[PDB]
Amino acid sequence: NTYVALYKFVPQENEDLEMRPGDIITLLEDSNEDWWKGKIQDRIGFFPANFVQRLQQNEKIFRCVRTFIGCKEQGQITLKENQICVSSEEEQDGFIRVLSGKKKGLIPLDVLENI
Q1: Distance CA 61, CA 82 (A)
Q2: Sign of the torsion angle spanned by Cα atoms 89, 111, 76, 104
Q3: Rounded to whole angstroms, how far apart are CA atoms 5 and 104?
Q4: Residue 88 backbone class (left: φ over 0; alpha: ψ -120 to 50; beta: rest)
Q5: Which residues form the SH3 domain?
């Protein structure tokens, strides 16, 4: 059961697991609503539950290299530079359908960096 960090998390106590946007978390315990326990590479600790997004099968992680304001009537998304998104789909006409939190929509390939 894996997740992707959407936002950084800076440890305040030793048991906190530092996160950077784009990190793949393996979930150990969904302890409470606020703080989950998990694993990034070899390290383990606690991280904010509300800063991660569930990774589904075949989904690839992307970083926006540039802010993109999309045409809502063309089903396009709006994401800011450094924001994380995911897609399991293929490109069409230079755009790909991505998911970033609750936002779902099309975004050009050239706005995305593969991480």
Answers
A1: 12
A2: positive
A3: 17
A4: alpha
A5: 1-57, 60-115
How far does CA 37 lie from the centroid of its chain?
Answer: 17
Q: How many CB atoms lie within 10 A of CB 93?
A: 8
Closest of 71, 73, 53, 70 to residue 62, by C-alpha: 53
Neighbours of 52 (CB within 10 A): 24
Query: 30: how many CB neighbours lie within 10 A of its CB?
Result: 12
**Which uninterrupted H or E stretch holds 100?**
strand 95-100
How, if at all, do strands 84-87 and 43-48 pair? Answer: unpaired
CATH superfamily, domain at 1-51: SH3 Domains (2.30.30.40)
Two structure tokens written together for 86:
């995911």
Question: What CA–CA distance (Å, rounded) separates 58 from 69?
Answer: 26
Task: Kindly give the pairing relationship between strand 43-48 and strand 52-54.
Answer: unpaired
Name the one residue in this structure whose structure tokens are 């991660």: 52
Resolution in A: 2.4
